[PDB]
Amino acid sequence: MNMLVINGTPRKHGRTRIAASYIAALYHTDLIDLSEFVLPVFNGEAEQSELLKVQELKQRVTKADAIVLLSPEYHSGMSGALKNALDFLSSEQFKYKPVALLAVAGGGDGGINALNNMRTVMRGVYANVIPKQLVLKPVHIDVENATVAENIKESIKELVEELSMFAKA
Amino acid sequence: MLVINGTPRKHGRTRIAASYIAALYHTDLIDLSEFVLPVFNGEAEQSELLKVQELKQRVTKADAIVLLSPEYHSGMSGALKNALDFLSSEQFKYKPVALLAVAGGGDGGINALNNMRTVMRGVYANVIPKQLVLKPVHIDVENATVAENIKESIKELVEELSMFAKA
Amino acid sequence: MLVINGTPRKHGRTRIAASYIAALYHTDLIDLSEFVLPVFNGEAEQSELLKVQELKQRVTKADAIVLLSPEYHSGMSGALKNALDFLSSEQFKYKPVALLAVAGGGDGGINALNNMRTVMRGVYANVIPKQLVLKPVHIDVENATVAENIKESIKELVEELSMFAKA
Amino acid sequence: MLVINGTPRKHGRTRIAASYIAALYHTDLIDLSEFVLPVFNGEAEQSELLKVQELKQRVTKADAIVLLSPEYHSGMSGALKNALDFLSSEQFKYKPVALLAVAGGGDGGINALNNMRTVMRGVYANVIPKQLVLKPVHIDVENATVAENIKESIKELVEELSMFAKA
Ligand SMILES: Cc1cc2nc3c(=O)[nH]c(=O)nc-3n(C[C@H](O)[C@H](O)[C@H](O)COP(=O)(O)O)c2cc1C
Ligand SMILES: Cc1cc2nc3c(=O)[nH]c(=O)nc-3n(C[C@H](O)[C@H](O)[C@H](O)COP(=O)(O)O)c2cc1C
Ligand SMILES: Cc1cc2nc3c(=O)[nH]c(=O)nc-3n(C[C@H](O)[C@H](O)[C@H](O)COP(=O)(O)O)c2cc1C
Ligand SMILES: Cc1cc2nc3c(=O)[nH]c(=O)nc-3n(C[C@H](O)[C@H](O)[C@H](O)COP(=O)(O)O)c2cc1C
Numbered sequence: 223m224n225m226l227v228i229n230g231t232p233r234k235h236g237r238t239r240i241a242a243s244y245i246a247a248l249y250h251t252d253l254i255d256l257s258e259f260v261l262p263v264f265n266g267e268a269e270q271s272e273l274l275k276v277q278e279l280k281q282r283v284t285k286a287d288a289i290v291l292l293s294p295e296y297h298s299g300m301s302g303a304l305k306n307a308l309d310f311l312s313s314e315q316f317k318y319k320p321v322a323l324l325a326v327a328g329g330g331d332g333g334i335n336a337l338n339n340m341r342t343v344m345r346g347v348y349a350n351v352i353p354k355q356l357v358l359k360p361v362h363i364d365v366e367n368a369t370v371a372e373n374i375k376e377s378i379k380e381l382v383e384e385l386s387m388f389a390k391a
Numbered sequence: 392m393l394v395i396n397g398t399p400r401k402h403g404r405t406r407i408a409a410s411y412i413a414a415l416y417h418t419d420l421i422d423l424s425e426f427v428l429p430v431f432n433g434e435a436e437q438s439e440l441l442k443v444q445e446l447k448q449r450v451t452k453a454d455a456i457v458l459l460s461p462e463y464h465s466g467m468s469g470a471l472k473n474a475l476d477f478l479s480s481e482q483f484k485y486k487p488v489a490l491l492a493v494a495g496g497g498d499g500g501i502n503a504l505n506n507m508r509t510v511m512r513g514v515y516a517n518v519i520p521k522q523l524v525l526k527p528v529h530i531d532v533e534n535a536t537v538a539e540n541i542k543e544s545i546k547e548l549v550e551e552l553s554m555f556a557k558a
Numbered sequence: 559m560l561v562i563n564g565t566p567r568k569h570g571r572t573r574i575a576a577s578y579i580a581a582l583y584h585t586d587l588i589d590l591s592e593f594v595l596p597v598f599n600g601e602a603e604q605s606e607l608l609k610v611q612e613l614k615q616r617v618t619k620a621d622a623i624v625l626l627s628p629e630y631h632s633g634m635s636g637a638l639k640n641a642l643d644f645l646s647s648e649q650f651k652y653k654p655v656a657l658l659a660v661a662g663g664g665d666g667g668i669n670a671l672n673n674m675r676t677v678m679r680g681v682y683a684n685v686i687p688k689q690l691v692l693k694p695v696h697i698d699v700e701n702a703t704v705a706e707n708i709k710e711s712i713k714e715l716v717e718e719l720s721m722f723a724k725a
Numbered sequence: 726m727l728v729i730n731g732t733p734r735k736h737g738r739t740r741i742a743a744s745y746i747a748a749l750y751h752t753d754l755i756d757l758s759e760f761v762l763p764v765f766n767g768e769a770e771q772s773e774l775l776k777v778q779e780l781k782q783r784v785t786k787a788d789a790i791v792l793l794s795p796e797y798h799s800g801m802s803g804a805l806k807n808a809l810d811f812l813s814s815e816q817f818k819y820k821p822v823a824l825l826a827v828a829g830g831g832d833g834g835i836n837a838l839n840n841m842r843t844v845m846r847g848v849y850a851n852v853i854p855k856q857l858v859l860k861p862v863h864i865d866v867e868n869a870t871v872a873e874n875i876k877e878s879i880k881e882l883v884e885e886l887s888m889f890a891k892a
Contacts, residue, residue: 233433260430263470266400296431298513299466299506302473303430309469318854331691334668335509338843339466342502345842345854346465353819353849357665391892485687498858501835508679509672515687520652520679524832558725567767594764597804600734632847633840636807637764643803669843673800676836680799 226286230293230304295336316347333357393453397460397471455556462503500524560620564627564638629670650681667691727787731794733804796837817848834858
């Protein structure tokens with residue numbers, strides 16, 4: 223298609239999971255849901271590299287032409303679950319890969335810290351993070367309807383479109 | 392005082408630095424290379440896990456914490472962040488914390504420190520000014536200890552932490 | 559206690575916030591809106607100027623500092639950073655500091671806070687955990703003061719700052 | 726292509742590095758050590774100033790920018806930030822930008838880079854992945870040029886910048 227969406231929240235009832243679901247559906251992308259895609263904690267031993275899930279993670283990330291990286295803001299940073307998943311990876315999978323960042327925060331001043339955390343880590347693996355970044359609040363998520371609210375759809379639209387533009391370049 | 396090793400690798404350099412500090416100053420030690428937690432999932436039953444309970448108790452008990460982490464991809468280890476996701480200001484509020492990052496070289500270290508500092512402030516911890524970046528040259532793997540060159544810097548770090556803790 | 563207004567704009571919101579704190583908590587006040595310093599150039603003759611001498615002297619004399627800044631382009635004001643460039647850990651070492659940023663809206667505020675935080679610890683200052691982001695809704699321009707909705711948040715900020723100062 | 730020297734010091738190392746790049750790739754050059762601006766105050770009259778109009782014009786016409794800055798107190802120079810405060814996304818939107826920071830050594834460099842990356846993204850610029858930290862060893866002051874050991878890295882940096890600009 224050939225885009226990929228990664229849900230960074232490990233909570234099955236997490237808001238980030240809903241945002242990711244919507245994007246994956248509307249824009250016909252691959253979807254990695256960390257709430258369902260449970261990895262072991264990276265520990266650096268050889269057998270972990272043989273793990274089915276680990277090989278799948280690498281495979282699906284490499285084939286992606288562009289990645290929408292979503293994460294909830296936990297303690298002013300990305301989820302430990304998402305960071306752990308990335309710890310299995312490297313520039314091998316991310317080099318020059320167009321990445322759009324989206325953080326789901328709960329409080330008032332939350333969101334930017336998670337984004338910066340993700341941007342720094344992504345740049346660390348030589349990814350190409352696009353300028354436009356998005357912070358979602360509870361008001362942007364329609365839990366009862368398992369989708370995002372109308373108020374945020376335009377922003378997401380622009381995010382994905384800018385990502386696609388960088389991907390074509 | 393409590394020392395927390397943020398590297399999940401049993402052979403990690405960060406574990407060596409953490410062990411040295413813990414033994415030299417007779418502190419409590421939480422070693423994430425042995426202290427294995429499930430990946431946070433936000434479930435209530437998970438938060439009731441004995442290990443999670445233990446983590447909370449030992450952190451809140453601590454008068455001061457030396458927080459060590461390797462730099463993985465310009466940030467703290469996922470293992471450490473995952474452990475922290477189980478916790479909150481209830482365990483960290485106003486608690487004196489000293490930051491130490493072990494990087495593989497180059498320009499590594501600061502990103503991990505900043506990541507940790509931001510997260511710790513997020514849980515209302517009292518992060519002291521002095522922060523330390525260790526490189527492979529500062530670690531003696533053969534003898535499973537730190538190199539002589541960094542010992543004074545570590546001493547300065549701990550003593551400043553103690554100063555903030557007693558104040 | 560010393561309050562520093564980071565906004566160079568005479569009509570800026572940050573100036574209103576700063577003036578409020580200085581007035582109600584009877585503190586010293588450095589207003590970069592009219593405390594005009596030249597652009598740092600590293601020349602020795604600059605440190606001879608009475609304003610920079612005054613800046614250094616009032617910072618060292620302060621028992622605790624409330625550092626306010628607008629968020630310009632996801633960072634602290636150039637005016638404030640320029641003023642800080644004249645200074646160093648000589649004036650800031652272990653200085654209790656509380657951060658406050660004023661943002662135009664949206665997702666602004668945090669970047670300026672982090673910027674100031676990183677710079678402040680860079681000069682070895684003791685930045686307290688509690689930090690504030692003020693939005694237009696927190697500023698009562700018509701009455702040239704802060705809104706009632708933010709007064710006790712500031713109160714808490716000053717309280718925590720004082721606590722760190724006493725200890 | 727445009728090269729911006731962030732150091733306001735006429736004898737700054739950053740000025741040396743900037744001059745090397747500007748001459749090697751025959752680029753435009755804005756030298757803040759001699760391109761003096763007033764402290765931004767937000768008043769309409771300032772935008773009438775020749776230097777301000779010049780700054781805006783030369784930035785917009787640039788197809789790519791190499792942004793250099795010394796690390797002052799774990800951040801970009803106040804001189805550079807002040808200059809950027811005059812500008813906005815109107816001049817930087819989708820502009821390819823390569824970051825380079827000159828640090829006095831130690832753990833310095835990353836903080837200045839992060840500061841610049843955050844601010845640049847704040848004005849909607851397109852900051853490339855590759856970033857460079859130059860240290861004293863990478864600068865030959867007596868020869869008024871960069872050391873041979875860093876010439877390759879600088880080349881790779883400019884080449885990646887060109888690639889993103891040709892997109
Ligand atoms: C462990 C934990 C830490 C959190 N810390 C923050 C925070 O630092 N800032 C914030 O805005 N929200 C914070 N929240 C609230 C989340 O932003 C909120 O749950 C949001 O919906 C994203 O999380 P979710 O995708 O799992 O639902 C935290 C939530 C959890 C579970
Ligand atoms: C997954 C992973 C990512 C790493 N990324 C970085 C990096 O971003 N910057 C760096 O300086 N070193 C990096 N390294 C090297 C580590 O800093 C090095 O292993 C160091 O000894 C600390 O890790 P350790 O405690 O597990 O030994 C990375 C190592 C691993 C295993
Ligand atoms: C040059 C400039 C850049 C600005 N960039 C931002 C921004 O990055 N984020 C934001 O929330 N507000 C931004 N604003 C709006 C200010 O935050 C707003 O004016 C606020 O009141 C603080 O500035 P002040 O103290 O001068 O009033 C910017 C304002 C100016 C003058
Ligand atoms: C006001 C000031 C603050 C400085 N702070 C730092 C620092 O935070 N980290 C660092 O590595 N170097 C710092 N330095 C040293 C500079 O990195 C050094 O002068 C280097 O040559 C770059 O600055 P320059 O372009 O003016 O030469 C500082 C220098 C000055 C003048």
